[PDB]
């Protein structure tokens, strides 16, 4: 969508990822597995329910007014009553059809931008150590043990040390 | 080959469908409804207190003492008033009531 | 009908649950706001992307 | 804001038990609940949770099967529901909203109950 | 599932002297701890989320700091008010987790 991520470069998602909304899938020699990323998911769970309670908590119940009652004589009024409860229909049936359509749009931006920036501190970390082979997945040069993954998941990773493995490995298939 | 780390989003069996600016019936993992859609079908008993059914007279009769209305005499508490659409039976006597709808407005409170 | 509820309106009786209601524009009580909508769901998840 | 539970209660083993958890001035809220319950003299145990945003709850282990939390639409109020009471239950549960001065906060508990406290007992 | 674990259990001090109460848990959760006092018969309240971010309505005297796996609620003075059991609790993943409880009083 408005930044290319979901739908976009990450064609689909993860049906087997049940406890989060954003996050990764890993394989070594320990294992594989699907992993929620908790930071993402974590402010963007609290991002929605600001979001949810903005809309509805000023939407407080009230009590509806009289409907009243005219005679023959009084049909000025009468459409003077009627005319002030369709104006103000009209303008919160067509404001709250909006404003939820409006909602919606930027609700999905947002996750496609949480997405995004998830996949970028990855991509910013790994650097020549890893080639980005598309939707959204990284190849290591370098053998990447569960440990070494976390620290992925973390903002730690260590180029360096990593890094004489990955460069003999990135130039052997380079030559 | 190597080992492989993925970075990817949430599905789930949901068919939720929302509405967007520039799209329509799109399907979304989560969502929250805000519109209710659905009653009961029968007049209830507001904060326990039940409602003065008029019968088949309007607010006239009542007010007046329309024989018709014969059961509504124990009036004592009511949440709110319920006139049926065809209570014809008010004043009987051919007449005209002076500021009935102020009556009646007065009478909602 | 012998049934309790906190809005009352002239085709029956609705919940309160929500922000908004489309029965009917004729309500007493503490109701939500009456809409001539049909449909209003806000998003709160990802748009729903099963294996395609 | 201030939480307001239902109160006391005494039931007998192998019943079930409703505690409410209302708001105060808010009508309709998206804040998730958490349940806490504190047998006498011991700490605090967490129950479960809920999201009202995924529409979805979490329970601790101990108590899944056996625990329902539960929201109706979007009103604050949050219900907790126990069933199959035991002498072992007998405690103070506290409802909690997970929010702070910086709006939602789904993992720390801002704004408590008064508790609710519940005596089984045959 | 993570468990903490609380030290000292219970620990005794004077008025206005530095308290301090230590949190530790099985794995690293970063940031995601908060912290709570309890007065008897009283429902716990909220001083410390993020474990270093101070909850609205409590003093500055309450101070959080740690990240990781070791956690310290550090009292500047002491006040006859702060006389509570001081728990810590994990945000991190669910279930979520307190600890045994850290009672402070008096010294005489």
């Known amino acids: 969508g408005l930044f290319g991520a979901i739908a976009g470069f990450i064609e689909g998602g993860w049906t087997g990822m049940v406890d989060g909304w954003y996050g990764y899938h890993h394989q070594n020699e320990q294992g594989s597995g699907y992993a929620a990323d908790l930071k993402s998911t974590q402010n963007a769970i609290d991002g929605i329910t600001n979001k949810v309670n903005s809309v509805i908590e000023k939407m407080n119940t009230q009590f509806t007014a009289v409907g009243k009652e005219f005679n023959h004589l009084e049909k000025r009024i009468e459409n003077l009553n009627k005319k002030v409860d369709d104006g103000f229909l009209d303008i919160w049936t067509y404001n709250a059809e909006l404003l939820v359509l409006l909602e919606n749009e930027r609700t999905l931006d947002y996750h496609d931008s949480n997405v995004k920036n998830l996949y970028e501190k990855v991509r910013s970390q790994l650097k020549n150590n890893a080639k980005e082979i598309g939707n959204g997945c990284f190849e290591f040069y370098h053998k990447c043990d569960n440990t070494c993954m976390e620290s992925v998941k973390n903002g730690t990773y260590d180029y360096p040390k990593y890094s004489e493995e990955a460069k003999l490995n990135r130039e052997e298939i380079d030559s | 080959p190597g080992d492989t780390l993925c970075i990817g989003y949430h599905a789930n069996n949901s068919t939720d469908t929302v509405d967007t600016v520039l799209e329509k019936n799109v399907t979304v993992t989560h969502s929250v409804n805000l519109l209710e859609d659905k009653h009961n079908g029968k007049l209830c008993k507001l904060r326990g207190v039940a409602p003065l059914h008029l019968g088949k007279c309007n607010i006239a009769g009542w007010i007046l003492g329309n024989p018709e209305c014969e059961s509504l005499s124990t009036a004592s508490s009511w949440s709110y008033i319920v006139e049926t659409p065809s209570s014809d039976n008010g004043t009987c006597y051919p007449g005209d009531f002076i500021d009935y709808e102020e009556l009646r407005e007065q009478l909602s409170s | 009908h012998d049934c309790n509820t906190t809005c009352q309106t002239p085709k029956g009786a609705i919940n309160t649950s929500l922000p908004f209601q489309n029965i009917h524009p004729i309500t007493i009580g503490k109701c939500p706001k009456y809409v001539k909508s049909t449909k209003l769901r806000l998003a709160t998840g990802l748009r729903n992307i099963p294996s395609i | 804001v201030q939480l307001v539970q239902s109160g006391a209660e005494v039931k007998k083993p192998g019943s079930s038990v409703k505690v409410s958890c209302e708001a105060s001035?808010?009508?309709?809220?998206?804040?998730?609940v958490s349940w806490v319950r504190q047998a006498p003299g011991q700490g605090l145990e967490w129950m479960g949770g809920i999201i009202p945003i995924v529409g979805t709850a979490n329970y601790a282990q101990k108590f899944q099967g056996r625990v329902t939390i539960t929201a109706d639409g979007l009103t604050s109020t949050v219900y907790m529901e126990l069933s199959r009471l035991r002498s072992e239950d007998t405690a103070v549960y506290f409802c909690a909203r997970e929010a702070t001065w910086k709006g939602s906060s789904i993992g720390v508990l801002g704004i408590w109950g008064q508790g609710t406290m519940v005596t089984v007992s045959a | 599932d993570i468990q903490m674990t609380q030290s000292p259990s219970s620990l005794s001090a004077s008025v206005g002297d530095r308290v301090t109460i230590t949190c530790r848990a099985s794995?690293?959760?970063?940031?995601?701890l908060n912290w709570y006092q309890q007065k008897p018969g009283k429902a716990p309240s909220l001083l410390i989320f993020?474990?270093?971010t101070l909850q609205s309505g409590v003093p500055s005297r309450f101070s959080g700091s740690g990240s990781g796996t070791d956690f310290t609620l550090t009292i500047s003075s002491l006040q006859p008010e702060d006389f509570a059991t001081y728990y810590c609790?994990?945000?991190?993943?669910?279930?979520?987790?307190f600890g045994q409880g850290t009672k402070v009083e008096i010294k005489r």
């Open positions: 001035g808010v009508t309709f809220s998206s804040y998730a």
């Open positions: 609790q994990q945000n991190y993943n669910t279930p979520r987790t």
């Open positions: 794995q690293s959760i970063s940031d995601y």
């Open positions: 993020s474990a270093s």
